[PDB]
Every structure is written in structure tokens, then in C-alpha cells.
Amino acid sequence: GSRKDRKRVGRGPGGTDKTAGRGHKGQKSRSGAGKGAFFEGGRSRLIARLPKRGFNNVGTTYEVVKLSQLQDLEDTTFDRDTLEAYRLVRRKNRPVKLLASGEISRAVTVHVDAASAAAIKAVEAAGGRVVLPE
Amino acid sequence: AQINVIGQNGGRTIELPLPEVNSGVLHEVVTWQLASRRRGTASTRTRAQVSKTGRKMYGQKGTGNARHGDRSVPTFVGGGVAFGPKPRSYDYTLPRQVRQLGLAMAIASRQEGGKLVAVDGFDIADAKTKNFISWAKQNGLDGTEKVLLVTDDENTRRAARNVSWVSVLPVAGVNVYDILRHDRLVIDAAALEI
Amino acid sequence: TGKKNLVVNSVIRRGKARADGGVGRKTTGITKRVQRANLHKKAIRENGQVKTVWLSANALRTLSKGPYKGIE
Amino acid sequence: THKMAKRRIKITGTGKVMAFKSGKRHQNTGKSGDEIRGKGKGFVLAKAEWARMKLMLPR
Amino acid sequence: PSAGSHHNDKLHFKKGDTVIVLSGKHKGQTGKVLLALPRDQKVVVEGVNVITKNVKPSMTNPQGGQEQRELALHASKVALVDPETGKATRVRKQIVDGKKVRVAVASGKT
RNA sequence: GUAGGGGAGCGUUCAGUCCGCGGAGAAGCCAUACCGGAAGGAGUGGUGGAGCCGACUGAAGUGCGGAUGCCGGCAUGAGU
RNA sequence: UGUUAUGGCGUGCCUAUUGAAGCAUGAGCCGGCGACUUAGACCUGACGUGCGAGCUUAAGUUGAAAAACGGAGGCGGAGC
RNA sequence: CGAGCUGGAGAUACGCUUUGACUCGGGGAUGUCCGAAUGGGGAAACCCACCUCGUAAGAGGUAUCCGCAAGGAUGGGAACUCAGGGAACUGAAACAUCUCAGUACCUGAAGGAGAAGAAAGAGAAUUCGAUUCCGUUAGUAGCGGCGAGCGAACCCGGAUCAGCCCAAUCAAGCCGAAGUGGCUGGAAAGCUACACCUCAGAAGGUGAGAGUCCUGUAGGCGAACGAGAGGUCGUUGUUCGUGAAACGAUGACUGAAUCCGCGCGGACCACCGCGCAAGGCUAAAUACUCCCAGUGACCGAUAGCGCAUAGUACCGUGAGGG
Ligand SMILES: [K+]
Ligand SMILES: [K+]
Ligand SMILES: [K+]
Ligand SMILES: [Mg+2]
Ligand SMILES: [Mg+2]
Ligand SMILES: [Mg+2]
Ligand SMILES: [Mg+2]
Ligand SMILES: [Mg+2]
Ligand SMILES: [Mg+2]
Ligand SMILES: [Mg+2]
Ligand SMILES: [Mg+2]
Ligand SMILES: [Mg+2]
Ligand SMILES: [Mg+2]
Ligand SMILES: [Mg+2]
Ligand SMILES: [Mg+2]
Ligand SMILES: [Mg+2]
Ligand SMILES: [Mg+2]
Ligand SMILES: [Mg+2]
Ligand SMILES: [Mg+2]
Ligand SMILES: [Mg+2]
Ligand SMILES: [Mg+2]
Ligand SMILES: [Mg+2]
Ligand SMILES: [Mg+2]
Ligand SMILES: [Mg+2]
Ligand SMILES: [Mg+2]
Ligand SMILES: [Mg+2]
Ligand SMILES: [Mg+2]
Ligand SMILES: [Mg+2]
Ligand SMILES: [Mg+2]
Ligand SMILES: [Mg+2]
Ligand code: NA
Ligand code: NA
Ligand code: NA
Ligand code: NA
Ligand code: NA
């Protein structure tokens, strides 16, 4: 038992020791020692000198709801805004968006916060109604 | 598939974890467990600042046959330690699903040999201890192999004090290390069980 | 020291370049970054008996108009 | 370094450098034709590695 | 350097109780208690006899010789015996003096 | 085959577990012509006078010829 | 096995270097001490394991010869 | 508490002890001299006074800063807390900002904790609702020779959760189950054959390894009685470096209103929304550790504190080192 209990045969491998190797002189030869401030960033080595700026904003990010999630499987247990948390679309703090990806005819009803044109001309086209906040 | 010794009779409940017990799986577990036990203890003046010593010494160039600055450095008999033991933790949180699976697989390991259960211990009757042993002698519990009792009820524990025979485990505080530590196992109560 | 509350204790002093220009210049370079302090003035005033202590100009102007726990 | 955030090197699907053209744009310009309207895309298969390592996490 | 502190610095006997030697030398041999030293756990009993020699440099007529003296022991005894063997006296009681307690095992005669 | 990368292992201390050894005597030290592909391991004897191998697993203050290295002891220069 | 005569052969060690027995560096000898560590739910990759289109908690609470509770939150899930 | 005691002290002599010696707790009484040192002086542990009470001895008082008085304070503390004042190396592979960093040091004040605190707030939901700390938000928003690099807060979870008052069981200690023979041995607690206890199989000692020999542990008992405004100018804080730069704070000049009122909501204005200063106090959750107990994949003396005691010997005029 507790003595015949082995390992995963390939889980934890021995650590790398630098003391003793009958030919080990760790690190480079010269210019590498008790100095850990070389870095790989900076501002002259492939970084800066580049000509950008743009403008940072970041406003509202929506939650993609793949059409195949509503349709295809499931048996329409109503979307709403609470029972949909169990449809593997739990995020909170942000609105919900409906997007069209799955192509299949089925009459379902959708209650999100915003939706795409195509999605609206995809759900109603097969039976249903997408309801948006007033 | 283990039948209760005193009282009812079932044992067909509780599904057994596949495959037929896996060593490594218990490995990961015990290791984690003993790891959460190790205490943070490291009496070492790794720091050269932590030991008692000045900062200046002999002249850089001149004296000859020297070249040192303080007397607290690792190269000095009496100084600090280079990369010594610091007081740390080493307590992580092995994924729950895996801890649940652990003891399941442990009991599993005990369901293919030394498995034993019991409902109600009216046979105990106060501390006494003596009649407890006498009892064991009627349950294959010679006192040759190590055993673990995981049952509630104070009065029953109170009557259970020895080293090689059995072992007391309050409020079903099961633990893969414990069960796998002792040979036989005595679940007794069906609290956590079924 | 003054009379009312604590005084002195002063801050630093900055010095820039290219003052003004054609509606916003390039930028402002700081060059100074040194640190100084501020002193005060006293006066002969008494309270209850014969005193002199200290009297800031502010508290002087304020005291002359209204005797807030004291008198000229 | 926050600079990397507004610098052409965004995180794409695959994970490579989004660059433009740093040939000549503002100051100093007034020769050639479409060399100015050449604000396309850039990609390097030798400095991606050592570049995304200051923005890969904050994708 | 510790010594005798391992016990609570109390003796389980007095300086006039007959005791026997359990383990060591003079097994079964009994005698009376002369010196009882609680701290150092030392006990003098007319049993363990050791022929020592007192060195007297210049103390008015030296005349060196081997005198007869006793050697102390630790808890290497058994205080109080009645059935002719050692015992673990505990049971306390009283006869006419309620201020003091007594001892015994399965008998009562200590 | 140098820098360098990759792989399999030896050894030491602590820890859990198991099998145990010890006054007819542990560890340590000392000798040796035996064993293993290496790190190493073992038998016997001598010394010693209390504790300690092997296996498996976990963790490191883990392996020294060098640094005009640190401490300590003892040499050479000389019976000068 | 030990020791020894004779024959053949034979340019200390390390370091640093295009190049060392070097008349380049270090070092009297032995013993002991003495150098790639630790931390940050950090970042990235290999391997292994538990779950799996979902996967996990942190502070803490209650219990500690044992551990469970705790889903504020983070990562998947759509990009431009 | 129940026989011993007569300090580390190895020795000798004289002695104290059932009228309970020592030892262990807990209150008192004596405490020269110096030291905040405070009668005065003073190169500390010395020198010199006066007054009062008196049988000489002797005792008592005699400093300064607040008060009618009582009383309290100038002192000392390893670390921790707040405050006044405030670096540089270093980094930017140079260096002026900025970082280092309000770090180190200095100083003042106070406690067993402090700070802070009962909204002229945060914030954008017409919301939460003293403060602090922890998790998270997040390394986002944002700052920056826009370089090096620096870096919040709201929501939510959790530790703990109170707002009331002015001006107009742990320390002594006792009790406490259960073994004899034979054998190797210098000596067994080991081997061996039987037996017992077990609300006690923690541990230490005892000639060696130890349930039943000792001290103890589980458990039980346990005292006399001892604790529990705005603005201008110069600048600064917060993520905020003069930038569109609000707001708080402050030095110098000035100087508003109060009910169809005042401040604020990142110049400014209207709308809208939140909130009412210029008065104070206030457990807990938090920090640290001289001291004590327990514990350790902590050391076992070239380690571990510097010290298996010593800040000693030793070095220095000294701080200081050791
Ligand atoms: K290697
Ligand atoms: K070498
Ligand atoms: K993987
Ligand atoms: Mg080198
Ligand atoms: Mg080179
Ligand atoms: Mg360095
Ligand atoms: Mg950097
Ligand atoms: Mg360059
Ligand atoms: Mg020399
Ligand atoms: Mg040391
Ligand atoms: Mg264009
Ligand atoms: Mg011995
Ligand atoms: Mg080392
Ligand atoms: Mg050497
Ligand atoms: Mg030389
Ligand atoms: Mg030497
Ligand atoms: Mg001569
Ligand atoms: Mg000569
Ligand atoms: Mg000569
Ligand atoms: Mg050669
Ligand atoms: Mg030569
Ligand atoms: Mg040479
Ligand atoms: Mg040279
Ligand atoms: Mg005086
Ligand atoms: Mg300041
Ligand atoms: Mg600037
Ligand atoms: Mg500033
Ligand atoms: Mg203002
Ligand atoms: Mg030492
Ligand atoms: Mg030594
Ligand atoms: Na993008
Ligand atoms: Na431009
Ligand atoms: Na050998
Ligand atoms: Na006593
Ligand atoms: Na620099």
C-alpha cells in the first residue's frame, strides 16, 4: 500500500543542479553574473521607433450567444434573463447579444438585450420573437 | 457490497470508483495532505543583514592576501547562509473533485480485503475498554493488524485507546492517509457512509 | 510661531522654460525642483495680563476687528 | 509597459504582430506618390516572439 | 545540568522506612533509610556497602585507611514492603490523626 | 569533443511508511587482494560504547582542489 | 598483495586564451565552512493527473490527532 | 506541601526544624547612594547647607511647569502607530525631471494598541450609507523627458459592526488503575512463559529499550483570597509631473451668504442629482513583540542568538567593535 504506492511515471522530473558536472561553468562565459536586469523589452530594440497612437476607449462589450446554442439542441426552456444563466452564458455586468451562426429551422423565442439584423431575420423567419428592452 | 455486522444488512449501495483503485491517484492526494501538514520552520540567517557584524574591514588594495569587506558573508565561518531556509507555507489547494475522489478510491481499496462495518455498538457499555477488546476478538480483530474507527458517539471513542489494535476518528474526519495507513477499516456508523 | 493654529512649514519651488508662446508652446520643462520655507511677523499684544507673544498679520487684521479670546 | 497598448502589435486570432508602415508619414514628406497612402499592414516572422511578451496577457 | 528535575522533586519515602533494592546489585536486599535527598534523588540505605578510603593530607595524624561508608542510589529501590516484596502503595486513609494521610496497597500495614 | 541542450542514475540530511537489527554490542573510525557500466555498494576483522541499516515516497542549508576564499591545526625556511 | 631493479613511454592542476609544462594567473599542507535559491491566485512552455464545452475558487466561517463550507472573481465561449 | 533544610559551590564548623524548616503562591513592613534626581554644587554614585520635629541618634522638607484645592506632568521602553523635518548611492546601461522614496535617519507625543471615524462622501443605480483591515476589482482606468517606471477607486464577498453629546476559567496543590518468576548481563525497563489496567499507549527519569518501579498523563477535587467659504500668487496631496486640471491643503494679500440658501458632481454653463463644513468624543475587526506556553520533514556547537552565557576577555581617546 503506502509503500507500494508509486508515482505517475512521468509526473515530476528531477530538478536541475548546477554544482558538479566535471565540466559545468553555468551561464555564459563572460558578462552574465549576479545581475538579473537585462530584460527583453526596453524601448530601442524592436519596440518604440514605431509610429502609432490611435486612441484608447473601451466602452461596452457584448456577450456573443451562438445561434446554435438556442436552436439545435435544448427544448426551449425560455431565455428571459435568469433561466438563461444555466445555458452556459453566465457573465454578468454586461448586456447580451444575439448572433447568427447555426443554420437550422426551429420555432424558438429569444429575450436578450441586443441582437443583430441577421439574427432577427433568422429567428422570426423560423417562428419566434426577439424582445429588446424599452 | 459489504454487509453490516451488527444491525441491518445492505452494502450494495455506493458505487465504486474506476478502475479497480489507482495508486498514483492516491499518491497525488496523500502528498498534498502531508504537504498541508508541514509547518513553516526555518531558523536560518540567510540574510547577511540578519547576523551581527560590521560593514568595513581591511583595505581593498594594499595589505595583500585579503580582499574582503564585511565578516557576515557566506564565505565566512560565522556569517550568514547563502540561499538558506526561509519560513514559508507550501499549502496549496488540491482540486476538490480530486479530494472527493481520493477517499472514495481509498475505501474502494479497502473493499477488496479488510472491510468492516457495524450499526449500533450496544456491546460496548461504558468505557471499560476490556470488553471492547473482547468484542474485537469476535470480529476477526485479533489485534494483529492496525485498524481505523470512523464513527460518531463519544462513549464509543472513550472506550478505544491503543496503538496496534485500533484508532479513534472523531466526526467522520476521514482522510486517505489515515485509512491507507491502517490495515483494516471500521466505518461503523452510516453517517458519511450511504 | 503665530497665535492661532500652527504656521511656517512651507513647500518647494519649480522653474520652467519657454514661458507662453503661440497658443500653447511645445511643453514645459522643469529645471528647479528645490525646496524652501516661509517665515512670519510678530507684534506686542497682551492677554489677561502683560504679554507680547506673536501675532500673524492675518490674525492681526482679524483680532483688530474682533477680540476672539484676546485683546489688542 | 503601457506604451505597447497603443502600438501596432495587437493580439490577433493566430497570435502575430500587427504592424503598419513606419517609412515616412508626418514630418518630412512631399515626394513620391502613393508611398504616403501606403498605410497597410505589417507582419514579422522573426520578432513576434520577443514582442508579444509584453502584451500577450492583456489581450 | 538538569538532574533529579525529571521527577517532581519529591520522595516516595522517608528517612526511617525499611526498603528493598529492586534491580541493580543486592537484589532483594533490604535495609533502613539513613539519608534522603529529594533533589539529587539520592538515598542512603545500610545495604549497598562500599569500602572507600578517605584521603587526609595534613589533618593531624593522617594515617590513611579504608573506612566503611555508604553509597547513595536513585529511585532504584522500592519504598515500603510488607508481603516481602516491592509494592505500589497509594490507598490513603486515617486512624486517629485526620491531619495526616497514610499508605498501603492491598494490605494496609505500612 | 569546449560553450550549450537532452536522458538515465549514485550519494547525503530531514519526514512518512514497512521489514527489522543492537550488551553475545549500533553509529563513527581503521584495514582489505570482493561486487557493479559510473556515481558507489558489501563481506570479514580491528576500534568503539550507544543507537542505526534496507525498501518505497516526500522535502532540501545536498556532493569542493581551486575563489591572493573563511576558521582551525600543523609543516618549510633551521636548530638558522 | 608489497617492495624493487631495468627497459619503453611520458611537457603538474586550474584559470584565461588564437595558442599553456609554461619563465602567464591562483595556491604551504589537511580538516572543517563555502556559491543558481526563495517569493509573488504573476507570464510562457513541456510532462502528469482530475473534470470536460465548461473548468476552479479568494478572504473567511465552522471544525483540527482529520477537513469541509465559502462562486465576490479569474480563464473558455467572436471577431474586427 | 509533609521532612527535610543549611543559595550557583565540589569543603569544613556551628545550627534551624511537628510550637510544621525549607520550597511554591499572594499581600505588607524595611529599601543606604546614584540615576527624570528634584536643597545647592557636581568631572553620577561625591562635597556642602538651611529650616522643622528633638533624648542625643534619627526622621522629615526644601526643583521647575499648569491650579483655590485635589492632582497631574517633565523619565524610561525592542517593535508597532501618528506627527514635524527629510537624503543619497541606485534606476533611466550617461544625466537635470521622475524613480529610489515620503525609504533610511532625526525629532516630538502616546498606548497596550494607535491612526481614522458618525458625511458640504463615494457614485451614476434617482444607489449604497461611520472608520479600519482582508479578498477582489487589476494591474484595469489613469499618470509619465508618454521614457525608465509608477498605479487608484466604485460594485461585490468577508472580519467586525454602537453612535451619543455642544454653540445659537487561567497561578499554588492534592487525588489518581495495572507484574512476578526464570534466562544472557557489570547492571534490564530487554528475551521468555503467564497476568492485569486501560474516562490514563503523551512524555521524562530510573545501571539498557521503559503501560503496570518513580514523577506524571485521562478524570476529579481545589483556599484565606489574588486577577479577568471662495478667489488671486507661490506649491502640494490623491493615479494626476501644468496638462482641458477639478477638489482638498497651506504661506501671503483679500474677503460671501444662510431659505425662491450654500458646496460638490475632473475648466466652465444650464438642467439634474447627491450632500448640509468652519465644534468634540467614541469598543471591536488591524500592527508588533521585550516576556510566557506549546509546537517543528529548525540547528546539534566552524550549526543555532554574538554568547550551551559574555556583550565578558580583548581593541579603541571615544562613538564603537568583539
Ligand atoms: K544535465
Ligand atoms: K575547476
Ligand atoms: K495538459
Ligand atoms: Mg570565468
Ligand atoms: Mg569574450
Ligand atoms: Mg548584487
Ligand atoms: Mg523592467
Ligand atoms: Mg539602440
Ligand atoms: Mg602572499
Ligand atoms: Mg551563526
Ligand atoms: Mg488616405
Ligand atoms: Mg552505556
Ligand atoms: Mg551549499
Ligand atoms: Mg583550499
Ligand atoms: Mg606567489
Ligand atoms: Mg591559515
Ligand atoms: Mg649550528
Ligand atoms: Mg641558511
Ligand atoms: Mg650561519
Ligand atoms: Mg599536457
Ligand atoms: Mg618553471
Ligand atoms: Mg606560473
Ligand atoms: Mg592577468
Ligand atoms: Mg541632588
Ligand atoms: Mg513634508
Ligand atoms: Mg512634464
Ligand atoms: Mg505631484
Ligand atoms: Mg481650492
Ligand atoms: Mg558558535
Ligand atoms: Mg570548534
Ligand atoms: Na482588437
Ligand atoms: Na499625423
Ligand atoms: Na568501504
Ligand atoms: Na517540599
Ligand atoms: Na543610472
Ligand code: NA
Ligand atoms: Na522614535
Ligand code: NA
Ligand atoms: Na493654485
Ligand code: NA
Ligand atoms: Na564535535
